[PDB]
Design a protein. Structure first.
Lengths: 231, 231
C-alpha cells in the first residue's frame, strides 16, 4: 500500500482486476473510487486524496488540469471505447441501426431511455452529442432516465426500469444482464477516450510504479478483456 | 435537411458555426464530418455519402478528382491560412523566429514536436516541406509526435503532451489554450489553400444552396473570425 485511484465508473471492473493483480505481484494496495468522471474531477479540485485520475473523456481531465490539480507531465490518453444501446437479455428487442432515421419513440414503447446525466456524465455528454447530430435530441430529451454515472444508466436497464440505455461497449462486456442491440456510428460523436494522469504533487515512487503498470502488458490484457481499446 | 459536409479538421469551428447559421436562416440541416483531408478524400473515394468536400490542401482535392469522385465544374479555392508553431499559454516559451538558423533541438527540451502525420495530413505535409526547405527536417524527424489530423496535433500541445506543435494560424485563433510563438515564412512552403467542391452526382438544389452560402458574406465573416483568409 497504498495508492488511491479515482476512475470513471465504466472502468470499475477492469480497475478492480488490475488492482488485485498489482497487489499480488507488487504487494501494494490500490484503493479505487468509481463515479462519473465529472464527480471525480470536482472532488479532486475540492481536495480529495486521490493519487491518480482516469477520466472517460478528455473534457473532465481538461477541467482538472485547468484547475491546476493535475501533474500535466504525466497526462496521456490510455484507452478508447464505443458508445452503444443496450437492452436486457430477457428483452425481445431486436437489433436496430442508429442513424438519422432511427424511430426512438417506437423503440421506447412509452418507456424511458437510460443515460448518464447529459449535463455532466461523460457517457451522457457523448450521447447528447450523437443524438443532436442525428437529429434525435429534441424528441428524446423529455424521454430520458438520467443517472449519476454510466453504471447507474446500465443498472436501470439491468433492473428493467428502462427498456433501453446508452452506455459504453465495455459496459455491455462487463454485464451478464444486458446485450448490445445497437452501436453508435463512430462519426456521430467525439472519440470515446480515457486520459490518465497523476494528481499534482502525488507522483512518488509507488504511484509511479502503478502508473507504469497501467501502461504495461498485464493491464492491457485486462483492459482488452473488458472491451476497451488500447491507445 | 439534409446536407453532408466532409471538411478538413482545421475547419471544425468555422463550419460548425456556418452550419448553425444556415439552419437558422434556411431551415436546412447540415451534418459535418471533420478529419484529416487525406482521410476524408479516401473515404469519399471508397463511397461515403458526402455531398461536399473542403480540403486543407490542393493535393487531396486533386487526389479525389483523379479518382473521378468530384464534380469538377464546382471546384474552386475558397480559403487561405498560415502555418505556425504554438505553445500552451501556461508555457514560458518565448516567441522565436523560424528560419534556417532555428535551434529546434534547444527549443524542444527533450520533448517532441506535435505535427499532423507528414505522410498524409495536409498540416504535416506543409510542415515537412517547410522544414526540409529550412534544413531542419533530418534533425526533427526523429523528434516528432505525429497526429491523425491537425486538431490532434493541436490537442497534444493543449494537453501539454508536447511543448510545441505545428498547426495553422486559424487553429491558434480557435484555441483558448495555446498561443502562436512563431510563424512560418510564407516562402518556406506551398500556400495553404482550401479548395471546395461538390461530390460527383451530388449537386442538387439543396447542396447548391449551401455551396453558394459558403461563398457568401455570412460565411465569409465566420471564416475571417476563425483566422482564415478569403480567396
Amino acid at each position: 500500500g497504498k495508492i488511491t485511484v479515482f476512475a470513471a465508473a465504466s472502468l470499475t471492473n477492469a480497475m478492480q482486476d488490475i488492482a488485485t493483480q498489482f497487489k499480488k505481484e507488487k504487494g501494494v494496495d490500490v484503493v479505487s473510487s468509481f463515479a462519473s468522471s465529472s464527480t471525480l474531477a470536482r472532488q479532486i479540485e475540492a481536495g480529495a486524496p486521490a493519487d491518480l485520475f482516469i477520466s472517460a473523456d478528455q473534457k473532465w481531465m481538461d477541467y482538472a488540469v485547468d484547475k491546476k490539480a493535475i501533474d500535466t507531465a504525466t497526462r496521456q490518453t490510455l484507452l478508447g471505447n464505443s458508445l452503444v444501446v443496450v437492452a436486457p437479455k430477457a428483452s425481445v428487442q431486436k437489433d436496430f441501426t442508429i442513424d438519422s432515421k432511427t424511430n426512438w419513440t417506437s423503440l421506447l414503447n412509452g418507456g424511458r431511455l437510460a443515460v448518464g446525466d447529459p449535463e455532466h456524465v461523460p457517457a451522457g455528454i457523448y450521447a447528447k452529442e450523437a443524438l443532436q447530430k442525428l437529429g434525435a435530441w429534441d424528441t428524446l430529451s423529455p424521454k430520458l432516465a438520467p443517472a449519476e454515472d454510466v453504471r447507474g444508466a446500465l443498472a436501470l436497464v439491468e433492473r428493467n426500469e428502462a427498456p433501453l440505455g446508452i452506455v459504453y461497449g465495455s459496459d455491455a462486456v462487463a454485464s451478464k444482464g444486458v446485450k448490445v442491440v445497437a452501436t453508435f456510428p463512430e462519426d456521430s460523436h467525439k472519440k470515446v477516450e480515457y486520459p490518465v494522469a497523476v494528481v499534482e504533487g502525488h507522483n512518488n515512487a509507488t504511484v509511479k510504479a502503478f502508473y507504469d503498470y497501467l501502461k504495461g502488458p498485464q493491464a492491457a490484457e485486462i483492459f482488452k478483456r473488458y472491451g476497451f481499446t488500447i491507445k
